[PDB]
Protein backbone atom coordinates (compact mmCIF):
# COMPACT_ATOMS: atom_id res chain seq x y z
CA UNK A 1 0.00 0.00 0.00
CA UNK A 2 0.96 3.65 -0.69
CA UNK A 3 1.52 4.53 2.95
CA UNK A 4 4.03 1.71 3.40
CA UNK A 5 6.05 2.77 0.35
CA UNK A 6 6.11 6.41 1.66
CA UNK A 7 7.37 5.21 5.07
CA UNK A 8 9.99 3.09 3.25
CA UNK A 9 11.05 6.22 1.25
CA UNK A 10 11.50 8.16 4.53
CA UNK A 11 13.63 5.31 5.97
CA UNK A 12 15.70 5.18 2.73
CA UNK A 13 16.24 8.98 2.91
CA UNK A 14 17.55 8.68 6.49
CA UNK A 15 19.89 5.87 5.31
CA UNK A 16 21.02 8.06 2.35
CA UNK A 17 19.94 5.34 -0.06
CA UNK A 18 18.42 7.56 -2.75
CA UNK A 19 17.92 4.91 -5.44
CA UNK A 20 15.71 2.99 -2.92
CA UNK A 21 13.96 6.28 -2.07
CA UNK A 22 13.34 7.07 -5.73
CA UNK A 23 12.05 3.50 -6.46
CA UNK A 24 9.57 3.82 -3.57
CA UNK A 25 8.33 7.22 -4.73
CA UNK A 26 8.15 6.17 -8.39
CA UNK A 27 6.01 3.10 -7.26
CA UNK A 28 3.75 5.49 -5.32
CA UNK A 29 3.42 7.83 -8.36
CA UNK A 30 2.64 4.83 -10.66
CA UNK A 31 -0.45 4.00 -8.55
CA UNK A 32 -1.94 7.00 -10.40
CA UNK A 33 -3.40 8.95 -7.45
CA UNK A 34 -2.53 12.63 -6.97
CA UNK A 35 0.42 13.01 -4.53
CA UNK A 36 0.18 14.80 -1.17
CA UNK A 37 2.59 17.70 -0.49
CA UNK A 38 4.76 15.38 1.61
CA UNK A 39 4.85 12.65 -1.12
CA UNK A 40 5.60 15.25 -3.79
CA UNK A 41 8.56 16.56 -1.68
CA UNK A 42 9.89 13.00 -1.11
CA UNK A 43 9.79 12.14 -4.87
CA UNK A 44 11.59 15.45 -5.59
CA UNK A 45 14.34 14.93 -2.91
CA UNK A 46 14.95 11.31 -4.11
CA UNK A 47 15.36 12.28 -7.77
CA UNK A 48 17.33 15.41 -7.03
CA UNK A 49 19.92 13.22 -5.26
CA UNK A 50 19.88 10.49 -7.90
CA UNK A 51 20.52 12.93 -10.75
CA UNK A 52 22.66 15.13 -8.53
CA UNK A 53 25.27 12.40 -8.14
CA UNK A 54 25.53 12.17 -11.96
CA UNK A 55 25.63 15.98 -12.46
CA UNK A 56 28.51 16.21 -10.00
CA UNK A 57 30.40 13.25 -11.55
CA UNK A 58 29.82 14.80 -15.00
CA UNK A 59 31.32 18.15 -13.91
CA UNK A 60 34.37 16.43 -12.48
CA UNK A 61 34.96 14.19 -15.53
CA UNK A 62 34.25 17.14 -17.96
CA UNK A 63 36.87 19.26 -16.10
CA UNK A 64 39.45 16.41 -16.37
CA UNK A 65 38.76 15.93 -20.05
CA UNK A 66 39.45 19.62 -20.71
CA UNK A 67 42.69 19.57 -18.58
CA UNK A 68 43.90 16.58 -20.62
CA UNK A 69 43.95 18.44 -23.92
CA UNK A 70 47.11 17.29 -25.72
CA UNK A 71 47.14 14.02 -23.66
CA UNK A 72 45.54 11.59 -26.16
CA UNK A 73 45.04 8.37 -24.14
CA UNK A 74 43.88 10.25 -21.02
CA UNK A 75 41.53 12.58 -22.90
CA UNK A 76 39.86 9.68 -24.71
CA UNK A 77 39.34 7.69 -21.54
CA UNK A 78 37.76 10.72 -19.90
CA UNK A 79 35.52 11.32 -22.96
CA UNK A 80 34.20 7.78 -22.90
CA UNK A 81 33.62 7.91 -19.14
CA UNK A 82 31.84 11.26 -19.49
CA UNK A 83 29.62 9.66 -22.19
CA UNK A 84 28.77 6.77 -19.84
CA UNK A 85 27.82 9.20 -17.00
CA UNK A 86 25.82 11.29 -19.55
CA UNK A 87 23.82 8.19 -20.56
CA UNK A 88 22.93 7.49 -16.92
CA UNK A 89 21.95 11.15 -16.39
CA UNK A 90 19.75 11.25 -19.51
CA UNK A 91 17.99 8.03 -18.42
CA UNK A 92 17.25 9.50 -14.99
CA UNK A 93 15.90 12.73 -16.48
CA UNK A 94 13.77 10.82 -18.96
CA UNK A 95 12.37 8.61 -16.17
CA UNK A 96 11.28 11.78 -14.17
CA UNK A 97 9.98 13.48 -17.31
CA UNK A 98 7.93 10.38 -18.14
CA UNK A 99 6.35 10.39 -14.62
CA UNK A 100 5.62 14.08 -15.06
CA UNK A 101 3.86 13.50 -18.43
CA UNK A 102 2.02 10.27 -17.62
CA UNK A 103 0.91 10.93 -14.03
CA UNK A 104 1.93 14.08 -12.26
CA UNK A 105 1.03 16.91 -14.65
CA UNK A 106 -2.30 15.42 -15.94
CA UNK A 107 -3.52 14.53 -12.36
CA UNK A 108 -2.54 17.93 -10.89
CA UNK A 109 -5.90 19.37 -9.91
CA UNK A 110 -4.46 22.23 -7.78
CA UNK A 111 -2.56 25.33 -8.91
CA UNK A 112 0.26 24.81 -6.37
CA UNK A 113 0.91 21.25 -7.58
CA UNK A 114 0.65 22.37 -11.26
CA UNK A 115 3.38 24.97 -10.63
CA UNK A 116 5.53 22.51 -8.67
CA UNK A 117 5.42 19.91 -11.46
CA UNK A 118 5.85 22.33 -14.34
CA UNK A 119 8.86 23.79 -12.45
CA UNK A 120 10.21 20.20 -12.05
CA UNK A 121 9.74 19.63 -15.82
CA UNK A 122 11.74 22.87 -16.46
CA UNK A 123 14.48 21.64 -14.09
CA UNK A 124 14.86 18.22 -15.69
CA UNK A 125 14.94 19.60 -19.22
CA UNK A 126 17.54 22.07 -17.82
CA UNK A 127 19.64 19.10 -16.59
CA UNK A 128 19.33 17.51 -20.06
CA UNK A 129 20.36 20.85 -21.62
CA UNK A 130 23.53 20.89 -19.43
CA UNK A 131 24.67 17.70 -21.36
CA UNK A 132 22.98 18.19 -24.74
CA UNK A 133 24.63 17.58 -28.18
CA UNK A 134 24.79 20.90 -30.06
CA UNK A 135 22.18 19.50 -32.41
CA UNK A 136 19.61 18.49 -29.74
CA UNK A 137 20.25 21.42 -27.46
CA UNK A 138 17.82 23.91 -29.03
CA UNK A 139 14.78 21.65 -28.68
CA UNK A 140 15.72 20.72 -25.07
CA UNK A 141 16.32 24.36 -24.11
CA UNK A 142 12.89 25.22 -25.64
CA UNK A 143 11.16 22.47 -23.64
CA UNK A 144 12.77 23.73 -20.39
CA UNK A 145 11.83 27.36 -21.05
CA UNK A 146 8.21 26.54 -21.99
CA UNK A 147 7.71 24.43 -18.84
CA UNK A 148 9.16 27.22 -16.63
CA UNK A 149 7.15 29.90 -18.49
CA UNK A 150 3.88 28.02 -18.00
CA UNK A 151 4.69 27.43 -14.29
CA UNK A 152 5.60 31.17 -14.03
CA UNK A 153 2.24 32.36 -15.44
CA UNK A 154 0.29 30.13 -13.08
CA UNK A 155 2.33 31.13 -10.00
CA UNK A 156 1.95 34.81 -10.86
CA UNK A 157 -1.85 34.42 -11.10
CA UNK A 158 -2.49 32.09 -8.13
CA UNK A 159 0.20 32.64 -5.54
CA UNK A 160 1.37 35.47 -3.33
CA UNK A 161 4.90 36.82 -4.19
CA UNK A 162 6.19 35.30 -0.86
CA UNK A 163 4.90 31.78 -1.67
CA UNK A 164 7.97 29.40 -1.48
CA UNK A 165 7.00 27.53 -4.67
CA UNK A 166 6.64 30.85 -6.52
CA UNK A 167 10.01 32.01 -5.14
CA UNK A 168 11.75 28.68 -5.92
CA UNK A 169 10.44 28.79 -9.46
CA UNK A 170 11.79 32.35 -9.90
CA UNK A 171 15.14 31.17 -8.52
CA UNK A 172 15.50 28.19 -10.87
CA UNK A 173 14.12 30.01 -13.90
CA UNK A 174 16.59 32.90 -13.27
CA UNK A 175 19.44 30.29 -13.14
CA UNK A 176 18.08 28.84 -16.43
CA UNK A 177 18.40 32.31 -18.03
CA UNK A 178 21.90 32.88 -16.65
CA UNK A 179 23.49 29.46 -17.29
CA UNK A 180 21.50 27.94 -20.14
CA UNK A 181 20.35 30.94 -22.24
CA UNK A 182 23.45 33.01 -21.34
CA UNK A 183 21.18 36.04 -20.72
CA UNK A 184 22.45 37.56 -17.46
CA UNK A 185 20.24 40.70 -17.65
CA UNK A 186 17.01 38.64 -17.94
CA UNK A 187 18.41 36.40 -15.12
CA UNK A 188 19.02 39.45 -12.87
CA UNK A 189 15.71 41.04 -13.78
CA UNK A 190 13.81 37.87 -12.96
CA UNK A 191 15.62 37.41 -9.62
CA UNK A 192 15.40 41.11 -8.63
CA UNK A 193 11.66 41.34 -9.36
CA UNK A 194 10.96 38.13 -7.41
CA UNK A 195 12.99 39.39 -4.41
CA UNK A 196 11.55 42.92 -4.54
CA UNK A 197 7.93 41.77 -4.93
CA UNK A 198 8.36 39.48 -1.90
CA UNK A 199 9.92 42.30 0.25
CA UNK A 200 7.07 44.64 -0.84
CA UNK A 201 4.47 42.05 0.46
CA UNK A 202 6.39 40.50 3.34
CA UNK A 203 3.21 40.86 5.54
CA UNK A 204 1.86 37.91 3.43
CA UNK A 205 4.53 35.51 4.87
CA UNK A 206 2.94 32.74 6.97
CA UNK A 207 4.32 31.38 10.28
CA UNK A 208 4.21 27.90 8.57
CA UNK A 209 6.51 28.81 5.70
CA UNK A 210 8.24 32.14 6.37
CA UNK A 211 11.62 30.45 6.94
CA UNK A 212 11.21 28.48 3.64
CA UNK A 213 10.38 31.78 1.84
CA UNK A 214 13.20 33.80 3.42
CA UNK A 215 15.75 31.06 2.69
CA UNK A 216 14.85 31.20 -1.05
CA UNK A 217 14.95 35.02 -0.91
CA UNK A 218 18.53 34.80 0.45
CA UNK A 219 19.46 32.54 -2.50
CA UNK A 220 17.86 34.97 -4.97
CA UNK A 221 19.79 37.88 -3.56
CA UNK A 222 23.05 35.98 -3.30
CA UNK A 223 22.80 35.01 -6.99
CA UNK A 224 21.94 38.62 -7.83
CA UNK A 225 24.97 39.79 -5.86
CA UNK A 226 27.21 37.29 -7.70
CA UNK A 227 25.81 38.26 -11.08
CA UNK A 228 25.93 42.07 -10.61
CA UNK A 229 29.49 42.04 -9.19
CA UNK B 1 31.61 24.22 -7.77
CA UNK B 2 29.02 26.48 -9.39
CA UNK B 3 28.87 29.80 -7.54
CA UNK B 4 25.18 30.58 -8.05
CA UNK B 5 22.50 28.29 -6.64
CA UNK B 6 19.27 26.65 -7.71
CA UNK B 7 16.73 25.23 -5.12
CA UNK B 8 18.50 22.96 -2.62
CA UNK C 1 44.85 -4.26 -20.31
CA UNK C 2 45.65 -3.80 -16.58
CA UNK C 3 46.98 -0.28 -16.98
CA UNK C 4 43.77 0.91 -18.63
CA UNK C 5 41.60 -0.53 -15.86
CA UNK C 6 43.83 1.19 -13.21
CA UNK C 7 43.50 4.54 -15.04
CA UNK C 8 39.71 3.96 -15.22
CA UNK C 9 39.71 3.27 -11.42
CA UNK C 10 41.52 6.60 -10.81
CA UNK C 11 38.95 8.43 -12.99
CA UNK C 12 36.07 6.67 -11.15
CA UNK C 13 37.59 7.70 -7.77
CA UNK C 14 37.73 11.36 -8.87
CA UNK C 15 34.06 11.07 -9.98
CA UNK C 16 33.17 9.45 -6.60
CA UNK C 17 31.79 6.43 -8.42
CA UNK C 18 33.10 3.72 -6.09
CA UNK C 19 31.19 0.76 -7.54
CA UNK C 20 32.90 1.51 -10.92
CA UNK C 21 36.22 1.89 -9.07
CA UNK C 22 35.76 -1.42 -7.27
CA UNK C 23 34.74 -3.25 -10.52
CA UNK C 24 37.91 -1.96 -12.22
CA UNK C 25 40.14 -3.03 -9.35
CA UNK C 26 38.42 -6.41 -8.96
CA UNK C 27 39.00 -6.99 -12.78
CA UNK C 28 42.68 -6.08 -12.28
CA UNK C 29 42.98 -8.48 -9.28
CA UNK C 30 41.26 -11.30 -11.28
CA UNK C 31 44.05 -11.16 -13.90
CA UNK C 32 46.04 -13.01 -11.19
CA UNK C 33 49.24 -10.91 -11.16
CA UNK C 34 50.56 -9.49 -7.88
CA UNK C 35 49.32 -5.88 -7.38
CA UNK C 36 51.63 -2.85 -7.18
CA UNK C 37 51.42 -0.62 -4.07
CA UNK C 38 49.33 1.89 -6.04
CA UNK C 39 46.90 -0.83 -7.31
CA UNK C 40 46.62 -2.32 -3.84
CA UNK C 41 45.72 1.15 -2.42
CA UNK C 42 43.11 1.74 -5.18
CA UNK C 43 41.39 -1.65 -4.56
CA UNK C 44 41.35 -0.86 -0.81
CA UNK C 45 39.92 2.72 -1.23
CA UNK C 46 37.20 1.42 -3.65
CA UNK C 47 36.02 -1.34 -1.32
CA UNK C 48 36.29 0.76 1.79
CA UNK C 49 33.81 3.22 0.22
CA UNK C 50 31.52 0.51 -1.15
CA UNK C 51 31.18 -1.22 2.23
CA UNK C 52 31.41 2.08 4.06
CA UNK C 53 28.14 3.28 2.55
CA UNK C 54 26.43 0.11 3.86
CA UNK C 55 28.06 0.34 7.34
CA UNK C 56 26.80 3.90 7.67
CA UNK C 57 23.28 3.05 6.41
CA UNK C 58 23.24 0.06 8.80
CA UNK C 59 24.12 2.26 11.81
CA UNK C 60 21.39 4.73 10.93
CA UNK C 61 18.70 2.06 10.36
CA UNK C 62 19.83 0.11 13.52
CA UNK C 63 19.51 3.33 15.60
CA UNK C 64 15.96 3.93 14.21
CA UNK C 65 14.92 0.36 14.91
CA UNK C 66 15.97 0.73 18.56
CA UNK C 67 14.17 4.14 18.92
CA UNK C 68 10.98 2.54 17.56
CA UNK C 69 10.66 0.04 20.39
CA UNK C 70 6.95 -0.11 21.23
CA UNK C 71 6.05 1.15 17.69
CA UNK C 72 5.19 -2.17 15.95
CA UNK C 73 4.72 -1.20 12.27
CA UNK C 74 7.71 1.19 12.30
CA UNK C 75 10.02 -1.21 14.12
CA UNK C 76 9.23 -4.05 11.70
CA UNK C 77 9.82 -1.91 8.64
CA UNK C 78 13.17 -0.81 10.04
CA UNK C 79 14.10 -4.45 10.86
CA UNK C 80 13.41 -5.61 7.34
CA UNK C 81 15.31 -2.66 5.84
CA UNK C 82 18.24 -3.32 8.18
CA UNK C 83 18.21 -6.98 7.01
CA UNK C 84 18.30 -5.85 3.35
CA UNK C 85 21.30 -3.52 4.02
CA UNK C 86 22.98 -6.36 6.02
CA UNK C 87 22.64 -8.70 3.02
CA UNK C 88 24.33 -6.15 0.74
CA UNK C 89 27.11 -5.60 3.32
CA UNK C 90 27.74 -9.34 3.75
CA UNK C 91 27.93 -9.80 -0.05
CA UNK C 92 30.50 -7.01 -0.34
CA UNK C 93 32.61 -8.44 2.48
CA UNK C 94 32.44 -11.92 0.99
CA UNK C 95 33.47 -10.58 -2.44
CA UNK C 96 36.63 -8.92 -0.87
CA UNK C 97 37.35 -11.97 1.26
CA UNK C 98 37.12 -14.18 -1.83
CA UNK C 99 39.65 -11.96 -3.71
CA UNK C 100 41.90 -12.12 -0.66
CA UNK C 101 41.76 -15.96 -0.55
CA UNK C 102 41.90 -16.69 -4.29
CA UNK C 103 44.42 -14.07 -5.45
CA UNK C 104 45.83 -11.56 -3.05
CA UNK C 105 47.07 -13.61 -0.08
CA UNK C 106 48.48 -16.59 -2.09
CA UNK C 107 50.31 -14.29 -4.63
CA UNK C 108 51.76 -12.00 -1.91
CA UNK C 109 55.48 -12.61 -2.27
CA UNK C 110 56.55 -9.64 -0.09
CA UNK C 111 56.17 -9.17 3.67
CA UNK C 112 54.63 -5.68 3.32
CA UNK C 113 51.91 -6.95 0.96
CA UNK C 114 51.32 -10.05 3.19
CA UNK C 115 50.69 -7.74 6.18
CA UNK C 116 48.50 -5.39 4.14
CA UNK C 117 46.28 -8.23 2.91
CA UNK C 118 46.08 -10.10 6.20
CA UNK C 119 45.13 -6.76 7.85
CA UNK C 120 42.43 -6.31 5.13
CA UNK C 121 41.14 -9.85 5.87
CA UNK C 122 40.93 -8.90 9.61
CA UNK C 123 39.04 -5.71 8.69
CA UNK C 124 36.46 -7.42 6.50
CA UNK C 125 35.78 -10.17 9.00
CA UNK C 126 35.47 -7.31 11.55
CA UNK C 127 32.80 -5.68 9.33
CA UNK C 128 30.98 -9.05 9.14
CA UNK C 129 31.26 -9.33 12.95
CA UNK C 130 29.59 -5.89 13.33
CA UNK C 131 26.41 -7.47 11.74
CA UNK C 132 26.73 -11.12 12.79
CA UNK C 133 23.87 -13.33 14.15
CA UNK C 134 24.70 -14.33 17.74
CA UNK C 135 25.21 -17.86 16.46
CA UNK C 136 27.70 -17.02 13.66
CA UNK C 137 29.49 -14.29 15.56
CA UNK C 138 32.06 -16.45 17.38
CA UNK C 139 33.46 -18.01 14.20
CA UNK C 140 33.58 -14.61 12.42
CA UNK C 141 35.27 -12.92 15.39
CA UNK C 142 37.83 -15.79 15.43
CA UNK C 143 38.56 -15.38 11.71
CA UNK C 144 39.12 -11.60 12.17
CA UNK C 145 41.41 -12.06 15.17
CA UNK C 146 43.51 -14.79 13.49
CA UNK C 147 44.01 -12.68 10.34
CA UNK C 148 45.07 -9.64 12.43
CA UNK C 149 47.29 -11.81 14.68
CA UNK C 150 49.11 -13.31 11.69
CA UNK C 151 49.54 -9.83 10.11
CA UNK C 152 50.78 -8.57 13.54
CA UNK C 153 53.49 -11.25 13.85
CA UNK C 154 54.79 -10.56 10.36
CA UNK C 155 54.81 -6.77 10.82
CA UNK C 156 56.62 -7.10 14.14
CA UNK C 157 59.33 -9.26 12.50
CA UNK C 158 59.76 -7.41 9.18
CA UNK C 159 58.87 -3.77 9.68
CA UNK C 160 60.17 -0.87 11.70
CA UNK C 161 57.74 0.38 14.47
CA UNK C 162 57.19 3.61 12.42
CA UNK C 163 56.16 1.73 9.23
CA UNK C 164 52.64 3.04 8.26
CA UNK C 165 51.30 -0.46 7.49
CA UNK C 166 52.55 -1.69 10.87
CA UNK C 167 50.98 1.34 12.58
CA UNK C 168 47.68 1.02 10.67
CA UNK C 169 47.46 -2.64 11.59
CA UNK C 170 48.01 -1.78 15.28
CA UNK C 171 45.29 0.87 15.00
CA UNK C 172 42.67 -1.42 13.46
CA UNK C 173 43.55 -4.41 15.62
CA UNK C 174 43.27 -2.19 18.76
CA UNK C 175 39.78 -1.08 17.53
CA UNK C 176 38.93 -4.79 17.01
CA UNK C 177 39.81 -5.45 20.69
CA UNK C 178 37.84 -2.45 21.94
CA UNK C 179 34.66 -2.74 19.84
CA UNK C 180 34.43 -6.39 18.87
CA UNK C 181 36.05 -8.29 21.79
CA UNK C 182 34.97 -5.66 24.36
CA UNK C 183 38.49 -5.78 25.89
CA UNK C 184 39.43 -2.13 26.45
CA UNK C 185 42.67 -2.89 28.38
CA UNK C 186 44.08 -5.07 25.55
CA UNK C 187 42.90 -2.31 23.11
CA UNK C 188 44.76 0.38 25.10
CA UNK C 189 47.82 -1.78 25.59
CA UNK C 190 48.04 -2.53 21.88
CA UNK C 191 47.61 1.15 20.91
CA UNK C 192 49.98 2.46 23.62
CA UNK C 193 52.77 0.02 22.72
CA UNK C 194 52.44 0.84 19.00
CA UNK C 195 52.57 4.60 19.71
CA UNK C 196 55.41 4.33 22.24
CA UNK C 197 57.54 2.02 20.08
CA UNK C 198 57.18 4.45 17.16
CA UNK C 199 58.14 7.52 19.34
CA UNK C 200 61.14 5.54 20.70
CA UNK C 201 62.38 4.95 17.06
CA UNK C 202 61.16 8.12 15.37
CA UNK C 203 64.64 8.47 13.70
CA UNK C 204 63.47 5.53 11.47
CA UNK C 205 60.71 7.72 9.86
CA UNK C 206 61.35 8.28 6.14
CA UNK C 207 60.80 11.58 4.26
CA UNK C 208 58.53 9.52 1.87
CA UNK C 209 56.12 8.35 4.56
CA UNK C 210 56.66 10.31 7.78
CA UNK C 211 53.37 12.21 7.38
CA UNK C 212 51.50 8.88 6.76
CA UNK C 213 53.14 7.44 9.94
CA UNK C 214 52.50 10.51 12.12
CA UNK C 215 48.87 10.73 10.98
CA UNK C 216 48.27 7.11 12.15
CA UNK C 217 50.14 7.87 15.40
CA UNK C 218 47.72 10.78 16.02
CA UNK C 219 44.78 8.38 15.53
CA UNK C 220 46.34 5.85 17.93
CA UNK C 221 46.79 8.47 20.60
CA UNK C 222 43.37 10.01 20.07
CA UNK C 223 41.73 6.58 20.52
CA UNK C 224 43.89 6.00 23.59
CA UNK C 225 42.81 9.38 24.98
CA UNK C 226 39.14 8.53 24.35
CA UNK C 227 39.48 5.10 25.91
CA UNK C 228 41.45 6.15 29.03
CA UNK C 229 39.15 9.13 29.79
CA UNK D 1 29.16 8.60 14.83
CA UNK D 2 31.72 6.28 16.40
CA UNK D 3 34.17 8.31 18.50
CA UNK D 4 37.27 6.17 18.00
CA UNK D 5 38.76 5.68 14.54
CA UNK D 6 40.10 2.91 12.36
CA UNK D 7 42.34 3.63 9.25
CA UNK D 8 40.73 6.29 7.04
Residue numbers in the entry:
A (entry chain A), C (entry chain A): 2 to 230
B (entry chain B), D (entry chain B): 1006 to 1013
Text from the published report:
interaction between the α4 integrin tail and 14-3-3-ζ. contained a single copy of the 14-3-3-ζ/α4-30pS complex. a high degree of disorder for most of the α4 sequence. position, which is a proline in the optimal motif sequence. hydrogen bond involving the Y128 side-chain hydroxyl. to 14-3-3-ζ in a mode similar to other 14-3-3-ζ/phospho-peptide complexes. that significant secondary interactions occur in the 14-3-3-ζ/α4 complex. interactions presumably too dynamic to observe in the crystal. phosphorylated α4 integrin peptide is weak compared to a longer one.
progression, programmed cell death and cytoskeletal dynamics. platform for the binding of numerous proteins. dimer, and each subunit contains nine antiparallel α-helices. classified as binding “mode-1” (RSXpSXP) and “mode-2” (RXF/YXpSXP).
